[PDB]
Design a protein around this ligand. Structure first.
Ligand SMILES: COc1c(C)cnc(Cn2cc(C#CCC(C)(C)O)c3c(Cl)nc(N)nc32)c1C
Length: 210
C-alpha cells in the first residue's frame, strides 16, 4: 500500500520557490546530491569503525551516476547509510524547518539559490531540473522504501518491491523536457570536475548503450 503525506508547510513553500523562480545556473543540483551521498558514505564508514558488522550489507563505498536517455532519468546511487522510514516521513522535514526559513530570509536579503547547500536543504535543488523525484533507500535497521514527489504539496512512501539494494540510496530524477543536457556525458563530466573534484569516494559515470 502507498501512504500519502503533506510536506511541512515551510518545505512546501521552498519547493514552490525553486520551481517557479527564474534561475539559469541549474547545474548546482548535481553538486548538492553528490555532497549528500558523500556525507552518507562518511556516516556508515564512521559507524563501521566500532561495529564492522554494519558493512555486512555491502563493503564497497562508492557513488554511481547513471543517465538514461530512453526514460529521461538521471540516477544517483550511493552505498551510504540510507534512510529509515521515520527519516523519510518526519525527521528530515523537521530538521529542515529552521534552515528552510533561514534560506528564504537570505534569498530576499540578497542570497542566490546556489547557497542552498549552506542551509542544509540542498536536496530540494533537484526540482530545478526534475518534474518528479523518486528516492529508493535502504538502512541497515529498516526495510527498503520508495519515496516519491512531484511537488504540489505531498509525497508518498511505500515499501519497495523492486530489486534489493543491500544498503544505501538511489535518487532518480525524472527530468523536465528542456533539461536533457544533464543526460550528456560531456556535460556531467564538466559539472563533476568543476564542483566535485575533492570528493573522497569513487564516482563512476555509466555510459549509455547506443
Ligand atoms: C527522501 O528524500 C530526501 C529528502 C526528503 C530530504 N533530504 C534528502 C537528502 N538526504 C538526507 C539523508 C539522510 C539522513 C538521516 C541521517 C541521520 C543519516 O543524516 C540522505 C542520505 Cl542518508 N543519503 C542521501 N544520498 N541523501 C540524503 C533526501 C534524499
Amino acid at each position: 500500500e502507498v501512504e500519502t503525506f503533506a510536506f511541512q508547510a515551510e518545505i512546501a513553500q521552498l519547493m514552490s520557490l525553486i520551481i517557479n523562480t527564474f534561475y539559469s545556473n541549474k547545474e548546482i543540483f548535481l553538486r548538492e546530491l553528490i555532497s549528500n551521498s558523500s556525507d552518507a558514505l562518511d556516516k556508515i564508514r564512521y559507524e563501521s569503525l566500532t561495529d564492522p558488522s554494519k558493512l555486512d550489507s555491502g563493503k564497497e563505498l562508492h557513488i554511481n551516476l547513471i543517465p538514461n536517455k530512453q526514460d529521461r532519468t538521471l540516477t544517483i546511487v550511493d552505498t551510504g547509510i540510507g534512510m529509515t522510514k521515520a527519516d523519510l516521513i518526519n525527521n528530515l522535514g523537521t530538521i529542515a524547518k529552521s534552515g528552510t526559513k533561514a534560506f528564504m530570509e537570505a534569498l530576499q536579503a540578497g542570497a542566490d539559490i546556489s547557497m542552498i547547500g549552506q542551509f542544509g536543504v540542498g536536496f530540494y535543488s533537484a526540482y530545478l531540473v526534475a518534474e518528479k523525484v523518486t528516492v529508493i533507500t535502504k538502512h541497515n535497521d529498516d526495510e527498503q522504501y520508495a519515496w516519491e514527489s512531484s511537488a504540489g504539496g505531498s509525497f508518498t512512501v511505500r515499501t519497495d518491491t523492486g530489486e534489493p539494494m543491500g544498503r544505501g540510496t538511489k535518487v532518480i530524477l525524472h527530468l523536465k523536457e528542456d533539461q536533457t543536457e544533464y543526460l550528456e556525458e560531456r556535460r556531467i563530466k564538466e559539472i563533476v570536475k568543476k564542483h566535485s573534484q575533492f570528493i573522497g569516494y569513487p564516482i563512476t559515470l555509466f555510459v549509455e548503450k547506443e
